[PDB]
Paper text:
Neuroligins are postsynaptic membrane cell adhesion molecules that connect presynaptic and postsynaptic neurons, mediate the transmission of signals between synapses, and shape the characteristics of neural networks through specific synaptic functions. NLGNs belong to single transmembrane proteins, and they all consist of a large extracellular, acetylcholinesterase-like domain (CLD) and a carbohydrate-binding region, following the transmembrane region of O-glycosylation helix and the C-terminal intracellular region as postsynaptic density zone (PDZ) recognition component, which mainly binds to postsynaptic target proteins such as Gephyrin and postsynaptic density protein, thus promoting synaptic differentiation and strengthening the stability of synaptic space and the function of transmitting intersynaptic signals. The ectodomains of NLGNs can form specific cross-synaptic connections with neurexins (NRXNs) of the presynaptic membrane, and these connections can be regulated by the membrane-associated mucin (MAM) domain-containing glycosylphosphatidylinositol anchor (MDGAs). The NLGN structures were highly conserved in both human NLGN2 and human NLGN3 dimer forms as two symmetrical elliptical spheres, and the interface comprises a four-helix bundle including two helices from each protomer.
Although the NLGN3 was used at full length, the size-exclusion chromatography and SDS-PAGE analysis showed that the molecular weight of NLGN3 was similar to NLGN2 ectodomain, with NLGN3 slightly earlier than NLGN2. As the C-terminal flag tag was used for purification and NLGN3 can be purified successfully, it is possible that the C-terminal of NLGN3 was too flexible to be seen in our case. For modeled human NLGN3 dimer, the protomer consists of an α/β hydrolase fold, a 14-stranded central curved β-sheet surrounded by 25 α-helices. The interface area is about 789 Å2, contributed by interface residues including H615, T619, F623, L627, W461, A462, F456, and A622. The overall structure of NLGN2 and NLGN3 protomers is very similar, with root-mean-square deviation (RMSD) of 1.518 Å over 522 Cα atoms. However, when chain A from NLGN2 and NLGN3 was superimposed, the orientation of chain B from NLGN3 has a rotation relative to that from NLGN2, indicating the distinct arrangement adopted by different NLGNs. The interacting residues were mapped to the previously identified patches A–C. The results intuitively showed a slight difference in patch B, where F408 of NLGN2 was substituted by Y431 in NLGN3. The single mutation R451C of NLGN3 is the first single-nucleotide polymorphism associated with ASD. Among them, R451C is a well-known mutation that is closely related to the development of ASD and has recently been found to enhance the gain of function in excitatory synaptic transmission. This residue locates in the central helix of NLGN3, and the mutation may affect the intracellular traffic and membrane localization of NLGN3.
Numbering used by the authors:
A (entry chain B): 41 to 150, 198 to 577, 591 to 633
B (entry chain A): 41 to 150, 197 to 577, 591 to 633
The structure:
């Protein structure tokens, strides 16, 4: 009977043993409420402390998730491959969503440990931390892991552009639960002074926005930002009023007064709100974080150059083939791409991102030239690879590299990595590289357990080894802020600085390199702004 | 007493032994006239057959060179390094120029009729002669006949009024006349008229490339070697002849109403003054040179290339690593580096000189700056110097030559491409430089077997001798058969170049075969730059 006393009462979890002998059992407390239910009047309001419970709360099962709908159309390119490919299994977790969803789960190994807090996210529309089991890395690394479910969708990110609905409510739930962890993880044997928060995809964007938030001050010390950033085109919504008014239109309270319209939208059922389709601009988001002046006073890059996040230890990275779905729709059975298709895709990308400025033709020709392998011009498979690389560099690699440059500007510890490995399975085509979300199983130690319903890949021994080393780096950074100390591998991960640009090649043979795709990074960072107004 | 009978009479040469024992002696006939003296009235006229002589003509010494002046200002970038650096020794050869300067020199080895090479010298279309180069080494080693000729140069060689008064291209006409002479008379020396190749370096390579595009050159030669030159370079053909011609006429005060009367007045003047006049053309352009006349060059060179004139010739061509050395030497600090301000200044100046302030110049300048910046080592000045060299080297030499090669092997005509990645060590060139303009000529003519000379004081090692032997073997093999690999084997095979494989040979102390020599920059200059502006 694993029991823990907290500032709000006692709760009992369950001790679960891992299938493999080598790692010992972990004690998991499932569904701990961190805030008062955001229901009724609390809707579209900052979270508030949860009420106390007198007895001993049973924490063994999974509370209902926040209102979300996977069948509703969402930007497919954003969601991780293991999510869309296994939507069927996703349905088992996502069934029975409820508005009262502000809960978290804890996994504790059997002095004080670091505390990892993982923020999930698919598209700011769906997702839950209920998917992932934090047991395995907790057991191997001897770290306390927490998973969290926060308000999502309209209830989580609706904004009216004013005091009627400031928005950014998901971030508020995250800081509220981070405060909960800071105040109460010492009860579980954790180290409040050693707290790190990490996420993949959109969750990484949430974390990166948190390090730029004044409200996040003092709660956490380190962070990991995986395959995400606050500078991406789909990170922060710059036109909230338009989509908010569109939603208000569809549900039938469009009124002139924003306060009256939100008092309307409090009455409607959450099922109606989620079931709506609102299609934003391609490679943009409809409902998400907005520049409110309180949580995010200004544009992300502004807060970056100002120097808020220089006091945190940050490790971040990208994957080689993130933008798989940018090209999956056009690939022929010959595993190649025709020149007409290449031109069509590049032109469409320019149209979507840059919205027809002056000098568009020069930019289009420059992009076509820069991502064409002139040593193998005629080859279609190389065309497919470069068409992947275009989206992968522009959407993921460049913002993350800019982030790293802005962090280590004054010598603050920073680490950069590129994931060059992935499982083999049927969820993804064989010709693909490591796409979006394929690093997730390794960091959470799926290879130690083997194939599961969410990750049915055929795992080999090399998969287990790479899972071990990557999770070891993660835990070492959590404990010391150094991926190399105190536990050694049985290669040293050097620090990243703006002139050396030292990064870690993670793969079957990990190593140290420099200037990760520096040419394309500089092309996007420097040359592209000059061509157009 | 080496004597030879020709269609015009008998001549006496001299037998000379090479300093190295292994190579045999060669017989040289110096100053064989291939045309009538172009003096007075025949000035600014096409060449005419040389009058015949009854007796035996002495062919022992070097005739006077064509009227030219090394002291007068000339584009320094165009001239080869061994020329400008050893201008002092060049002065000894260049002394006492004369207008009676249509002569050639033959060097013959001592089985069967032998292939014939004709070397077209050239520094800048202003200067130079075939006298400084002694082909005895190449003749002895390769067992081939070598000819070095003198053609009209400067004002007398390329004056053009844009009309029938002065069509120009008289130097091209001179080399056509000499090619006709050797074609008709080399069999007397034991050569093979069906196997003749013409080759040149720098400007001479541009002359050869223009000749292969000329209708007047059909049937005289079969192969050609174009080294570090092209007909597509910015200084190959003068597109503004009338402006500089009128400038010269104004300078000498021969300005009258009728252009025919003007060229008559130029005929009346002394030869030296026409040389001494300073007429500085646009930077990286030429003042006096070949023009689009409609007779020798009917149209623009690329038009003749795409039309298919030169597909009947076997072509081998190549470039060097650091041709554009002079483009950066003026700005290099004693630390062997370049400041970012210097880099920006030089790049902007290059854009100004070449493209002349078009619409969208600002965007193109930034694109060019980005493309030639090593973003893996941005702050390093030495790599900045290397990239500043490579910019000029690619734009002026590599891109036109690669375009030429692509236009030749389009329908499968045999083509060969090479890149020279080696050079001697010497004081004429700074130690940090790669093979610059004119560092390949010593090896093809095999000076390393002799050792250091007045014109190449380089400190030759054994590797120099070996590489020189290999390259002259390749050259001679191509001349004999049209195959660099046949019949004499190296003691690597040079594959053919085609637009799809782009196979080339890496000539150096480590020879090998590669593909797509700097394909990225070649495509950048060939494709993106035209679209960048207008």
């Amino acid at each position: 009977a694993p029991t823990v006393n907290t500032h709000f009462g006692k709760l009992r979890g369950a001790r679960v043993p891992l299938p493999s002998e080598i790692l010992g059992p972990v004690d998991q407390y499932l569904g701990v409420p961190y805030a008062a239910p955001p229901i009724g009047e609390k809707r579209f309001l900052p979270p508030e402390p949860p009420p106390s419970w007198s007895g001993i709360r049973n924490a063994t099962h999974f509370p209902p998730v926040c209102p979300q709908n996977i069948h509703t159309a969402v930007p497919e390119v954003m969601l991780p491959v293991w999510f869309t490919a296994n939507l069927d299994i996703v349905a088992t977790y996502i069934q029975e969503p409820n508005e009262d969803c502000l809960y978290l789960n804890v996994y504790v190994p059997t002095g004080a440990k670091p505390v990892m807090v993982y923020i999930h996210g698919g598209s700011y529309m769906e997702g839950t931390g209920n998917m992932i089991d934090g047991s395995i890395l907790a057991s191997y690394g001897n770290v306390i892991v927490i998973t969290l479910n926060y308000r999502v969708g309209v209830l989580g990110f609706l904004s009216t552009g004013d005091q009627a609905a400031k928005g950014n409510y998901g971030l508020l739930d995250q800081i509220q639960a981070l405060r909960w962890v800071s105040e109460n993880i010492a009860f579980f044997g954790g180290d409040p002074r050693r707290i790190t928060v990490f996420g993949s995809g959109i969750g990484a964007s949430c974390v990166s926005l948190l390090t730029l938030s004044h409200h996040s001050e003092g709660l956490f010390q380190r962070a990991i930002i995986q395959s995400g950033s606050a500078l991406s085109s789909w990170a922060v919504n710059y036109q909230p009023v338009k989509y908010t008014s569109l939603l208000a239109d569809k549900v039938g309270c469009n009124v002139l007064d924003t306060v009256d319209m939100v008092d309307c939208l409090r009455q409607k059922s959450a099922k109606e709100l989620v079931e709506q389709d609102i299609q934003p601009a391609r490679y943009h988001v409809a409902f998400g974080p907005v520049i409110d002046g309180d949580v995010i006073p200004d544009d992300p890059e502004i807060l970056m150059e100002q120097g808020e996040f220089l006091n945190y230890d940050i490790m971040l990275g990208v994957n080689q083939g993130e933008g798989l779905k940018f090209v999956e729709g056009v690939v022929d059975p010959e595993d190649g791409v025709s020149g007409t298709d290449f031109d069509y895709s590049v032109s469409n990308f320019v149209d979507n991102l840059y919205g027809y400025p002056e000098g568009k033709d020069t930019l289009r020709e420059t992009i076509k030239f820069m991502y064409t392998d002139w040593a193998d011009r005629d080859n279609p498979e190389t065309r497919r690879k470069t068409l992947v690389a275009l989206f992968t560099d522009h959407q993921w690699v460049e913002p993350s590299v800019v982030t790293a440059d802005l962090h280590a500007r004054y010598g603050s510890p920073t680490y950069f990595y590129a994931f060059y490995h992935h499982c083999q399975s049927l969820m993804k085509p064989a010709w693909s590289d490591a796409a979006h979300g394929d690093e997730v199983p390794y960091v959470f130690g799926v290879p130690m357990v083997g194939p599961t319903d969410l990750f049915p890949c055929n795992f080999s021994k090399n998969d287990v080894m790479l899972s071990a080393v990557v999770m070891t780096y993660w835990t070492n950074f959590a404990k010391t802020g150094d991926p190399n100390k105190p536990v050694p591998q049985d290669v040293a991960w050097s620090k990243y600085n703006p002139r050396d640009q030292l990064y870690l090649h993670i793969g079957l043979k990990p190593r140290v390199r420099d200037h990760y795709r520096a040419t394309k990074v500089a092309f996007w960072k420097h040359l592209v702004p000059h061509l157009y107004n």
